Structure formats: C-alpha cells, structure tokens
Design a protein around this ligand. Structure first.
Ligand SMILES: [Zn+2]
Ligand SMILES: [Zn+2]
Lengths: 124, 123
DNA sequence: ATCAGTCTAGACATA
DNA sequence: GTATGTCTAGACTGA
C-alpha cells in the first residue's frame, strides 16, 4: 500500500535501463500471446491469483533456448520470472519447474512455458 | 593539398555518413579476405580506373539488400557511393557495363560490387 | 504496389 | 558443453 501523494510523485519517477528493458520484454511477449486464444487471460489469471493453479502459457522455443529482446539475449522463463517474481534471480540454475508444468524449459520441446508460477526458485 | 592542412584535417571529425561508410567497407573486406584475388582485384580497380578489371562479388540476398550496422541498402549502390558518386541517389541512377558478369539486376547467387563495373545514368 | 524501416533467430565470434 | 555478446538476412510491417 502506498499514499496517493506518494504514488502521484512516483508517477514521475524515472525508470532505469533494466525496468525500461523489462517493459520491452513484456511488450514482446504480449505480441506473441495475443495470437493465441486464452493465453493473455491465462497469464493474467496466474499473475493475479497466485494461490490458484493455472495452465501453461508457452512461446516457441528457439534452437539454443535463448530469447532476444532489444539486443539483449536471455532465457525466457528466467526473463519472465524476474519480471513477475524474483527481480534478483541469478540464472536458470536457480530455477526448477513444477510438476504441473507440461512445457518446462528443460524439456526442450517445440513450446516453452513462461508461466512464472510454473517454476520454483532454488539454490545450486 | 598542403601538409599543414592535411595535418589539421587529420583531426577532422567524420560525420554519421562517413563513419557508416567506414563500417560498410569493413563489412566488405571481411567478405573479400575469404576469396583469393578479390582484395587485390578491387584495389586494382580503384587504383587504375582506366585499366579493365574483373568482377568482385559478394553473395546476393533474397531481396537484394545489404545491411551494415542497422542500415539497409543495395550493395552496388553502397560501394559506388563510396568510391565514385557520393551523391548517388538510387539504383535507378545506375546501369551495369557489358564487361560485368554479375551485375545487380542479374539476380544471381553473386552480385558484383566493383564500382567500375557500373556507369552512372539519369532516371 | 515498391519502398523503407524494425526486430530477432540463427550464425558466428570472443570468451 | 558454457556462455555471452555481436551482426545481419530474413521475416514482417507499414507507406
Ligand atoms: Zn507450464
Ligand atoms: Zn562485375
């Protein structure tokens, strides 16, 4: 919770390189998800009701696994998990897929799931 | 041209266009080093314009364009601007010489970028 | 329609 | 076998 005066002031806050980039990455993901009925709704369900189980929300997997957004390359699940869960997330080594996930990064299928709540954070 | 002047000109700032053209030449050299005779041949053509030279080609893309540092153009146009007509407008101002066996229009695997394998025309 | 421009997966290179 | 970053043809998108 935030004070109205404060959230107004925060309205004018400058976002940094990282936050500006993350917006680009979300923009990129939405372009993909609009093309699939149920995806946008589903992802919004997952983000809004974390406690309640949700479906896989996938994008095409590249040959090397990486995704490029505005001249940065990363791994998709890592990217989106940083955005919506663990901003300080280090690498894919700090992530394990839940059993409920049908399309986890490691499975190297056509599709890769980017539902942040289909992943759990770990050590290594 | 004077030594003091060329010294002073040493410190001249190149503009976006010239800096880009340096990149485009760099890009072309990377390609030509890989082909024995190409670099020498291109140098022959540039240095002895009067004397006939061979085709110097690079791979042709599907759409014909070449990209160098986030700018797209047509290769013969690019390299003709560099070494001949800086004010060259488009491929419409260019016609290939008969001596050229890989001219832009021929839409082959290779496209010739020897600037002296082209002549400048109106539109 | 050409034409012109943006974005990135795949290739490739510097580690 | 990683990994990280760069470049650009091709795919795509608007005049
Ligand atoms: Zn999933
Ligand atoms: Zn030629």
């Amino acid at each position: 919770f935030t004070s109205p005066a404060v959230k107004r002031l925060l309205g004018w806050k400058q976002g940094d390189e990282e936050e500006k980039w993350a917006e680009k990455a979300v923009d990129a993901l939405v372009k993909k998800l609009k093309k699939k009925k149920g995806a946008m709704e589903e992802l919004e369900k997952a983000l809004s009701c974390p406690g309640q189980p949700s479906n896989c929300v996938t994008i095409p997997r590249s040959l090397d696994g990486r995704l490029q957004v505005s001249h940065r390359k990363g791994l998709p699940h890592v990217i989106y998990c940083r955005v919506w869960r663990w901003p300080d997330l280090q690498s894919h080594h700090e992530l394990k897929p839940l059993e409920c996930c049908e399309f986890p990064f490691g499975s190297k299928q056509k599709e890769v799931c980017i539902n942040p709540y289909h992943y759990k954070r770990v050590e290594s």
